[PDB]
Amino acid sequence: GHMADQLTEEQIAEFKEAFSLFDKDGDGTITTKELGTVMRSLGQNPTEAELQDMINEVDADGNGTIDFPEFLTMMARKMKDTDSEEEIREAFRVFDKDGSGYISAAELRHVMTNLGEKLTDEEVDEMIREADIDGDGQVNYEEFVQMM
Ligand SMILES: [Ca+2]
Ligand SMILES: [Ca+2]
Ligand SMILES: [Ca+2]
Ligand SMILES: [Ca+2]
User: Which residues are recorded as modified (N6,N6,N6-trimethyllysine)?
Assistant: First the structure.
């Protein structure tokens, strides 16, 4: 069988109830009105245009609303995304061996060396310099997030 079918109908019904947090009239799609409702419940207040722009960047079939599949797709990407931030933070820590919040040439020297590379001091210092944005001689976490 398939793991997806390893639930009960009452359980799928219950899973579907959770969608109603956003899909308040229960019809199976989120409208701009419903999403505006949710936003305003969080203290925000966007326009019809802004609400239609949020919806559009998740609206896979083009019909102007968010069904439960699109929502779950959107959520899964979000969940994988926050994990990718956890691990860029993890990676910053590995480079920043002294936990000072800033990566030195020395610290980048070290990691590069332990990763195989055989670059010069200049080439490594050419990295810190190319990566710096506040000219402080070190690489804070944000200049590090610029590792695209
Ligand atoms: Ca609805
Ligand atoms: Ca849709
Ligand atoms: Ca450091
Ligand atoms: Ca810096």
Answer: 118
